[PDB]
Design goal:
Elements: H1 6-14, H2 22-26, H3 29-35, H4 46-55, H5 69-72, H6 74-84, E1 117-126, H7 139-154, E2 162-166, H8 172-180, H9 190-194, E3 206-210, E4 215-219, E5 225-232, H10 236-253, E6 258-259, E7 263-264, E8 277-283, H11 285-288, H12 293-299, E9 302-306, E10 318-323, H13 331-355, H14 369-375, H15 385-388, H16 392-398, H17 409-418, H18 432-435, H19 437-448, E11 480-489, H20 502-517, E12 525-529, H21 535-543, H22 553-557, E13 569-573, E14 578-582, E15 588-595, H23 599-614, E16 621-622, E17 626-627, E18 639-646, H24 648-651, H25 657-664, E19 666-669, E20 672-677, H26 685-702
Antiparallel strand pairs: 1-5, 1-8, 2-3, 3-4, 4-5, 6-7, 8-10, 9-10, 11-15, 11-18, 12-13, 13-14, 14-15, 16-17, 18-20, 19-20
PDB class: transferase
Keywords: transferase, duplicated, substrate specificity, transition state
Assembly: monomeric
């Protein structure tokens, strides 16, 4: 196989910004310099191995010119292998082949769990010693290899009796039939093509099927031998044993390449070790819809792949689920991983269907409260409010309960259940605060340092906007880089961004954007919806650090990124001193900011903005808690006033700062610090802004008495 120089391929792979392969990652100048004249014992080059990555940027891995490539080009392949197979300290190793004691081995039938499994499949691959791969085979040695393997297959035991079908000399009639029954491979994969997999097509190639059509072998498709056991249903035990018995019989007729580092050698590094892919096609629509579906699978040792194109238009939710591991475990460990993981995932799908039967459509489905409570046990009972107030009395009382519009207690602890360092819940709608009050009320009291009071949360008290108790905290020049004040707001009559439906989002965005588009004067600006953004706008918003992304796992697992990015948007006035985030965590985050330290103008602009938005919609507000938000941490005023502060001076005193902070109830984060009021609930908006203003103005006069 003639390819370009290794050096040319490297340049091609690197200059290709669509390419994010491991080949790209590890094919360094040093690797090229080292291996550019090197041949394997079969004549292969590293260029032949990485060729396909030059022309197919979506491909993650190299291939190999022959089985000796892994040893000959070891600095390249060990790095690629350790990386892809997640090998702890690059200590690549693999145990002896062991399918287990087949006579006493038993797995439960996977359809026990909801009858969701359409079919079950286990696949192996082997390299036969003494032969190259696509780039180093000749026409004749590939045929000799084919002859060697079909001869082995023909001699197989009774259950395996069947017919060998060479590709060469096959009628176009059987070709069509055999691919229909999904028995035939074709020369239609361009990654395989550019890795030399179709040279001398179709010679040296064929398939073997047994009489029962539950045993399939492919010769020289990619590997020398690919062996597949398969049937309808979830009978993994029979599928697995039929595969294991065949390969152990074949291993007496064929010498397969194995070493104690990589296990069984294959053409693609992804199939090293056991080479074993044990899988089901299962119907798991609800599980698949979960925000962290991929993570849930990986946590159970399972790799999911969708089956789009394999069904009719209205049939969805069918996934291929397989063991994620190939290398560094036995075949028994691998099929066990698949079985245990798939069993669990299928049990979760049944629990999901059961727990969300009759829930509103488009509303985030959720795992049973008791399931999530177990996950929540990882969280600290000392720090994590979510877990602290989730007593057995609370579980007993609220399990099975929904708000009028479909929110559950399960919903609101989900973010902490999957992110055990998250300390607060995320509610589903304003009614949560009355419906789950026995949970939420003590949590709120704790977090905000308050108690149950007989009296109404005071009305919004913004103050007199023309006669404020603060002005410019830094007239001089620079201690304050910038000042910012924001509130969160919920709109009455809508579910929160956590669990709300896509249709709700659209309708909410219509209400809000309409109001934003009509803002006049200092507040006049442009609404940028995330679904229909013009390219130029996207980049400017990032450079401005205005854009929000679907990248926080806590908000993700709360449901906050469902149906992305429908209904989400950014508004800012022309000056970029007034900003609104639409439907990120709360329905709105309303923000006023500017360079310098004029808090009064920032706060004034904010309040006027809130009011002008409020003309077109009602804000969710509570007698108990003031303004209602998704997270209980931002109740009350839901207001955060902050400054970007230069205090290199007293930052070098790291504990009269914290004492200036505790004393004036401020929070600090980093001689440049983001300083803000800590309180949200139990005080007026005017006071919140004024607490930050005094705490900061005092830092500042301390900051020259150095």
């Amino acid at each position: 196989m003639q390819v370009e120089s290794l050096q040319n391929l490297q340049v091609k792979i690197r200059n290709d910004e669509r390419n994010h392969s491991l080949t790209k990652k590890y094919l360094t100048d040093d690797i090229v310099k080292k291996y550019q004249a090197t041949k394997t014992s079969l004549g292969g080059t590293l260029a032949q191995c990485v060729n396909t990555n030059a022309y197919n940027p979506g491909a993650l891995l190299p291939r190999s010119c022959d089985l000796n490539a892994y040893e000959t080009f070891r600095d390249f392949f060990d790095a690629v292998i350790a990386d892809y197979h997640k090998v702890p300290d690059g200590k690549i190793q693999h145990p002896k082949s062991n399918f287990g004691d087949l006579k006493s081995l038993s797995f439960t039938d996977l359809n026990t769990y909801g009858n969701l499994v359409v079919s079950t499949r286990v696949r192996l691959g082997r390299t036969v010693e003494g032969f190259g791969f696509g780039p180093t085979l000749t026409k004749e040695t590939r045929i000799e290899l084919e002859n060697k393997i079909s001869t082995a297959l023909h001699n197989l035991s009774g259950e395996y009796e069947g017919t060998y079908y060479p590709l060469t000399g096959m009628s176009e009639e059987d070709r069509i039939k055999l691919v229909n029954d999904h028995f035939l491979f074709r020369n239609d994969d361009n990654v395989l093509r550019d890795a030399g997999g179709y040279i001398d097509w179709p010679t040296g190639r064929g398939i073997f099927i047994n009489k029962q059509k539950n045993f399939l072998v492919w010769i020289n498709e990619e590997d020398h031998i690919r062996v597949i056991s398969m049937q309808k249903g979830g009978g993994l035990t029979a599928v697995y044993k039929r595969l294991a018995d065949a390969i152990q019989e074949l291993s007496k007729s064929l010498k397969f390449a194995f070493n104690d580092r990589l296990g069984f050698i294959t053409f693609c590094p992804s199939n090293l070790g056991t080479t074993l892919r044990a899988s089901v096609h299962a119907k798991i629509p609800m599980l698949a819809s979960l925000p962290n579906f991929k993570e849930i699978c990986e946590k159970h040792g399972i790799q999911p792949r969708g089956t789009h194109g394999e069904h009719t238009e209205s049939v969805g939710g069918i996934y291929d689920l397989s063991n994620k591991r190939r290398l560094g475990l036995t075949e028994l460990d691998a099929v066990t991983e698949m079985h245990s993981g798939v069993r669990a995932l299928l049990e979760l799908e049944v629990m999901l269907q059961e727990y969300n039967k009759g829930a509103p459509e488009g509303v985030m489905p959720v795992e049973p409260l008791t399931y999530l409570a177990k996950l929540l046990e990882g969280a600290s009972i000392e720090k994590c409010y979510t877990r602290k107030y989730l007593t057995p009395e609370i579980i007993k009382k609220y399990d099975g309960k929904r708000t009028t519009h479909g929110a559950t207690l399960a919903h609101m602890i989900r973010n902490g259940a999957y992110n055990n360092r998250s300390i607060c819940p995320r509610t589903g709608e304003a009614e949560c605060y009355s419906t789950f009050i026995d949970y939420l009320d003590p949590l709120i009291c704790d977090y905000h340092g308050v108690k149950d009071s007989a009296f109404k949360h005071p009305a919004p008290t913004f103050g007199d906007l023309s006669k404020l108790p603060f002005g410019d905290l830094d007239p001089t020049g620079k201690f304050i880089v910038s000042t910012r004040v924001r509130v969160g707001r919920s709109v009455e009559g809508f579910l929160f961004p956590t669990i709300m439906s896509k249709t709700d989002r659209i309708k909410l965005e219509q209400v809000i954007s309409g109001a934003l588009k009509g803002l006049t004067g200092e507040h006049a600006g442009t609404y940028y919806p995330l679904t229909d953004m013009k390219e130029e706008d996207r980049k400017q918003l990032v450079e401005d650090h205005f854009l929000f992304k679907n990248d926080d796992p806590v908000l993700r697992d709360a449901g906050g990124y469902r149906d992305w990015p429908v209904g989400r948007g950014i508004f800012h006035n022309n000056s970029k001193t007034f900003l609104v985030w639409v439907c990120e965590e709360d329905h709105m985050r309303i923000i006023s900011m500017q360079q310098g330290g004029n808090l009064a103008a920032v706060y004034k602009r904010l309040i006027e903005g809130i009011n002008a938005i409020g003309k077109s919609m009602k804000f969710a507000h509570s007698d108990k808690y003031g303004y209602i938000t998704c997270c209980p941490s931002n109740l009350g005023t839901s207001m955060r006033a902050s400054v970007l502060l230069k205090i290199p001076k007293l930052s070098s005193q790291p504990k009269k700062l914290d004492e200036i902070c505790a004393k004036y109830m401020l929070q600090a984060r980093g001689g440049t610090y983001d300083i803000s009021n800590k309180r949200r609930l139990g005080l007026t908006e005017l006071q919140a802004a004024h607490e930050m203003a005094e705490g900061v103005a005092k830092m500042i006069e301390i900051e020259k008495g150095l």
